From a paper:
Next, we also obtained crystals of [name] alone and determined the structure at 3.06 Å resolution using SAD. The structure of [name] alone is very similar to that observed in the peptide-bound form, with only a handful of side chains with different rotamer conformations. Specifically, the side chains of residues such as Mse274 move out to avoid clashes, F230 and R209 are closer to the peptide, and residues E219, E211, and K266 change their side chain conformations to form hydrogen bonds or salt bridges with the peptide. The similarity between the free and peptide-bound forms suggests that the [name] structure is highly compact and rigid, and the “L” peptide binds via a structurally stable pocket on [name]. [name] is assembled into a highly rigid structure, not only in the apo but also in the peptide-bound structure.
[name] encodes three distinct [name] hemolysin coregulated protein (Hcp) secretion islands (named H1-to H3-[name]) that act against both prokaryotic and eukaryotic cells. TplE, a novel H2-[name]-dependent lipase effector, was recently identified. TplE is an antibacterial lipolytic toxin and [name] interacts with TplE to provide protection from TplE. TplE, a new [name] trans-kingdom toxin, targets the conserved and essential cell membranes of rival bacteria to cause bacteriolysis, while [name] functions as a cognate immunity protein to prevent self-intoxication.
Numbering used by the authors: 32 to 298, 305 to 333
């Protein structure tokens, strides 16, 4: 824990975070509500996918006597899009399946979502730009440029954009334990304590076998993070439920809603930790490493 030797600093969206080298990491990234998704397709494979999927939309009935395919849009920068009706019933909505590529190193990402007839051109203009802003980042590179980092790449820019990610992390040394780190634009209406506190006291006072290890402020650098940590024993198993949270500012990339959490279930398998001490060391070491990525 406190001995951050061999620990690896990672990139997720606008932020950085240190983690032990043993950690098993799995991340999800979302843009304008819709998931941006990495594909391990070499250029020929993607061409096959798009061709295969285009013909599928054509051999699929829309309403009575028309197919579901509409357009194959070219966003340039080696990227493409497929416009289709939102479903078998027209409504007034499409499905814009975007396939953006990274530069200079080749990767392709699928970014798909529904859009109305009256906003299709706008959505295209977004994909048009996402295509020329999506740049690749080297395996261990920590980009100095402004941008939202994703899998094997980042979306360059400091212009506002709703963005969100969620990283699930497990540790082999500490089995049963699960850490999660999430970011999301938009501000929550209450702080952590203002929201959850009342109910936690009503559960702790009601049910036995638990104690509030910590509570209150836990600022990390310029980030105003409150925290709540609960622990308890049952089944001869020691359970944990931690959380840290910056409630974030509206229309802000650098101070969005930002949450770190760690939990260990009960219900004897091997201990996730030796004691409460070891658990809070890991928790504090990781949370204190949270920070906005320095950007020129």
């Amino acid at each position: 824990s406190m001995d951050k030797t061999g620990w690896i600093t990672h990139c997720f969206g606008r932020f950085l975070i240190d983690l032990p080298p043993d950690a098993v990491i799995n991340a999800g990234y979302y843009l304008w509500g819709d998931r941006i998704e990495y594909l391990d397709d070499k250029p020929t494979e993607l061409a096959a996918r798009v061709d295969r999927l285009e013909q599928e939309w054509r051999t699929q009935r829309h309403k009575s006597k028309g197919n579901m395919f509409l357009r194959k849009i070219d966003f340039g920068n080696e990227s493409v899009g497929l416009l289709s009706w939102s479903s078998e019933v027209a409504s007034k909505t499409y499905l814009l399946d975007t396939y953006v590529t990274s530069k200079p190193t080749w990767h392709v990402y699928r970014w798909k979502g529904k859009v109305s007839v009256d906003r299709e051109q706008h959505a295209v203009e977004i994909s048009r730009a996402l295509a020329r802003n999506l740049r690749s980042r080297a395996p261990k590179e920590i980009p100095s440029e402004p941008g939202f980092c994703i899998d094997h790449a980042y979306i360059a820019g400091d212009s506002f954009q709703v963005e969100r990610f969620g990283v699930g992390v497990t540790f082999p040394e500490h089995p049963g334990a699960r850490f999660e780190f999430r970011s999301s634009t938009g501000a929550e209406l209450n702080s952590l304590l203002e929201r959850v506190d009342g109910f936690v006291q009503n559960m702790l006072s009601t049910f036995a076998g638990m104690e509030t290890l910590r509570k209150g402020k836990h600022p990390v650098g310029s980030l105003p993070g409150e925290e709540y940590l609960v622990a308890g024993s049952d089944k001869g198993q020691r359970g944990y439920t931690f959380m840290w949270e910056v409630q974030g500012k509206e229309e802000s990339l650098t101070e969005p809603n930002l949450t770190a959490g760690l939990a260990v279930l009960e219900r004897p398998p091997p201990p996730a930790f030796k004691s409460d001490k070891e658990a809070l060391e890991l928790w504090d070491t990781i949370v204190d490493s949270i920070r906005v990525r320095p950007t020129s």
